[PDB]
Amino acid sequence: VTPVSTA
Amino acid sequence: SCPTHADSLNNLANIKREQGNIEEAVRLYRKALEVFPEFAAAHSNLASVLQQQGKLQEALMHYKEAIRISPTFADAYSNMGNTLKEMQDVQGALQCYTRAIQINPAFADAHSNLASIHKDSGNIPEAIASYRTALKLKPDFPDAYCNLAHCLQIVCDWTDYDERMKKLVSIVADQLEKNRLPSVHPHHSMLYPLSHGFRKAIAERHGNLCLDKINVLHKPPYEHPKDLKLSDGRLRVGYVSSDFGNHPTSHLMQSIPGMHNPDKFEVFCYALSPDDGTNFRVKVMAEANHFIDLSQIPCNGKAADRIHQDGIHILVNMNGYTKGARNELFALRPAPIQAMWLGYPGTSGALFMDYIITDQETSPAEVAEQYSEKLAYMPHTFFIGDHANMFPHLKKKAVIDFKIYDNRIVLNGIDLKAFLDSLPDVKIVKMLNMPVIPMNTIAEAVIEMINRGQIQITINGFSISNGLATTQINNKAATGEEVPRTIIVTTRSQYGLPEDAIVYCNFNQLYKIDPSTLQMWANILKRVPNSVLWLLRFPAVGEPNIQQYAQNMGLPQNRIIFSPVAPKEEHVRRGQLADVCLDTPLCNGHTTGMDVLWAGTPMVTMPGETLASRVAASQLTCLGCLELIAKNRQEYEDIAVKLGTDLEYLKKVRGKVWKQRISSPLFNTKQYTMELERLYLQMWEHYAAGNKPDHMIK
Numbered sequence A: 001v002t003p004v005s006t007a
Numbered sequence B: 001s002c003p004t005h006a007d008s009l010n011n012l013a014n015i016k017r018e019q020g021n022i023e024e025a026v027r028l029y030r031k032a033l034e035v036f037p038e039f040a041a042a043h044s045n046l047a048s049v050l051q052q053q054g055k056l057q058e059a060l061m062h063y064k065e066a067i068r069i070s071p072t073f074a075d076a077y078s079n080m081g082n083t084l085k086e087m088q089d090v091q092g093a094l095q096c097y098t099r100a101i102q103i104n105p106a107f108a109d110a111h112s113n114l115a116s117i118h119k120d121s122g123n124i125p126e127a128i129a130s131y132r133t134a135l136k137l138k139p140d141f142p143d144a145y146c147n148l149a150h151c152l153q154i155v156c157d158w159t160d161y162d163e164r165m166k167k168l169v170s171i172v173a174d175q176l177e178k179n180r181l182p183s184v185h186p187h188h189s190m191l192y193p194l195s196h197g198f199r200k201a202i203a204e205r206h207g208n209l210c211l212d213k214i215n216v217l218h219k220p221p222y223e224h225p226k227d228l229k230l231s232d233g234r235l236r237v238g239y240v241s242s243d244f245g246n247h248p249t250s251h252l253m254q255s256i257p258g259m260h261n262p263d264k265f266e267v268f269c270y271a272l273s274p275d276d277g278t279n280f281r282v283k284v285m286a287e288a289n290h291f292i293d294l295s296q297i298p299c300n301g302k303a304a305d306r307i308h309q310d311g312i313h314i315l316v317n318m319n320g321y322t323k324g325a326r327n328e329l330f331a332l333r334p335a336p337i338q339a340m341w342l343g344y345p346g347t348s349g350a351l352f353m354d355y356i357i358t359d360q361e362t363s364p365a366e367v368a369e370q371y372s373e374k375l376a377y378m379p380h381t382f383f384i385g386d387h388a389n390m391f392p393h394l395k396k397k398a399v400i401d402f403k404i405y406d407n408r409i410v411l412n413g414i415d416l417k418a419f420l421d422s423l424p425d426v427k428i429v430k431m432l433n434m435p436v437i438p439m440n441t442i443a444e445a446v447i448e449m450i451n452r453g454q455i456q457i458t459i460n461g462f463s464i465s466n467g468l469a470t471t472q473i474n475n476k477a478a479t480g481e482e483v484p485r486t487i488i489v490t491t492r493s494q495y496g497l498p499e500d501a502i503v504y505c506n507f508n509q510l511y512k513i514d515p516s517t518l519q520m521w522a523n524i525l526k527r528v529p530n531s532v533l534w535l536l537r538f539p540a541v542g543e544p545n546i547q548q549y550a551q552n553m554g555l556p557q558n559r560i561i562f563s564p565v566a567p568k569e570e571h572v573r574r575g576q577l578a579d580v581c582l583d584t585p586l587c588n589g590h591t592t593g594m595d596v597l598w599a600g601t602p603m604v605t606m607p608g609e610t611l612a613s614r615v616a617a618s619q620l621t622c623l624g625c626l627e628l629i630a631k632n633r634q635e636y637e638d639i640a641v642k643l644g645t646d647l648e649y650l651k652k653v654r655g656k657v658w659k660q661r662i663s664s665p666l667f668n669t670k671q672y673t674m675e676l677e678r679l680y681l682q683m684w685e686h687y688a689a690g691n692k693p694d695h696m697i698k
């Protein structure tokens, strides 16, 4: 993965 | 015993629910069921107010009963599904939705819910398909419409965009006025042209969702400390995050807990997620004065107890409304002062949050009305990044001359200098200053490794790694968990970028681009005749959609170049190949801003009105590059075009960023921490003097 910020 | 008696009690409970007195609605539903226990609808209603209260275990039991009594109850299946989802049982929730759709093929909600599972999983085209089906079945369906809108946003489908935005605003406007919960998520509300007041109200209403879930705990107010006597003269700060691990948040602030001054501060890190085993988690655990794993304390009452019991003065919310948040903790109010910080780029809109830690450029006083919290200003930017610690191998570069360009073939490495001193003919171009290896046999061997797609070579006993192959060489280095121990070659040819062109990059997720931003960029590209635009397949399905709109604006295919998403370290490092970075005005690069600036790549930005659209300007102001900040579309294009056409100005600005990124306060985590410490003590001295929170604008 490459983690991003989500809702 | 009587079905008519029970039917009445159900209507009377449905009345208490509309009046918002949930408390009493439950007591009546429960009584309806004691009269007539085979009452499908009462089970269903009791279930869905238990769900609201976060009593999921028990809500599910009643849904199951509703279904047993009434097997064609598709509405009950759909909601049971929602309950299973919230319980982390995504498998079984899916089975609910599918099973509903099969019983009633015409039932819109189950389709929309099924689409939500798909969206969460990252399969966006299947999410879109289901949302569209839901909307065909029920054309007035705000939840499905707004979710679809966000899917379309994610992949850059801008079909009927202007009409779509007007409808979103209209949907939200109606929902706010009719006092129902808005279908737009607060974390997405910055992407649409809603009013600032609407955005705040959307957040407000998400805050309320906690209130019902904490009321059933029936907890009294906590008694907060009123001096620092018990905590030994030290102010106790608690950082609460679901992101102490491999997550942007940690890539920004991992160094801060350790840098607090232990004479005046006691640092408590409250992790909301289990140990993912990464070094980011390792470091925070090792450096915080106290690390507390709240993932092990799933009850919100017992967690809030634990916070209060630790004696925290300032509790910091690093999550806002992002995945993993547990704002119920903050709603219980176990600390006297609670501040939003760094993690969520917007207002909480909630009464339980006192301050938002921000700065004068991001949230100027003119727009204090956008936030429910009181502004607490950091002296420069509220933003910070761990790049100086994580990626020190990019503090210096060197190039190979293959014919003197700073971004065509690049070398970085901790032992770069020792390698260069083993070489015969190195020129030293002045600016620090940048070494240039000339076209040798050595240069030829490096470039052949790159061309033949090889992992690594050895030259004079130094290890020289191919930039595309880091995860094979040392995976922890690829992620930013370690500093690389080899010398790494990064080249334009690797990514299919033209050797002799102005490269404009934007490495954000594609959702941040809108049709005006793309227009702006096409304008720049036409005016700078050799340029390309470098974008990421983030996500890949967005690419053919951008390419499409790009051509209606009259740019040939070969003018926009897409690369795959890279591991963290490769991603940061390859910014060294770009000439200028064009920042999305709709929602700025945040972490990505820091990432591009660390490579010493100037970034052109156009600060909007929302917090999320002002961060990049704030980052640049702190760097000391006011000439990269545009007042409008026209000025943005002009700055970008000058940077591409005037090669002497480019060289000059690039050099300014490259120097400033060390010398300014932007990437300086020690100074940042100290400033944060000042601001904490201000917040506290104020509360100790017996005052309610008020703006800390210095």
Ligand SMILES: CC(=O)N[C@@H]1[C@@H](O)[C@H](O)[C@@H](CO)S[C@@H]1OP(=O)(O)OP(=O)(O)OC[C@H]1O[C@@H](n2ccc(=O)[nH]c2=O)[C@H](O)[C@@H]1O
Pocket: A002, A003, A004, A005, A006, B247, B248, B249, B251, B252, B342, B343, B344, B345, B507, B509, B536, B564, B565, B566, B567, B568, B571, B587, B588, B589, B590, B591, B592, B593, B595, B612
């Ligand atoms: C708008 C918004 O939500 N903003 C948030 C901020 O408000 C918060 O302060 C940030 C910390 O919580 S999160 C967030 O910051 P953003 O800049 O929007 O980045 P986002 O959330 O998509 O992540 C991209 C990641 O992909 C990495 N990235 C990118 C490309 C690549 O090839 N490889 C890679 O690792 C990047 O290095 C990143 O590690």
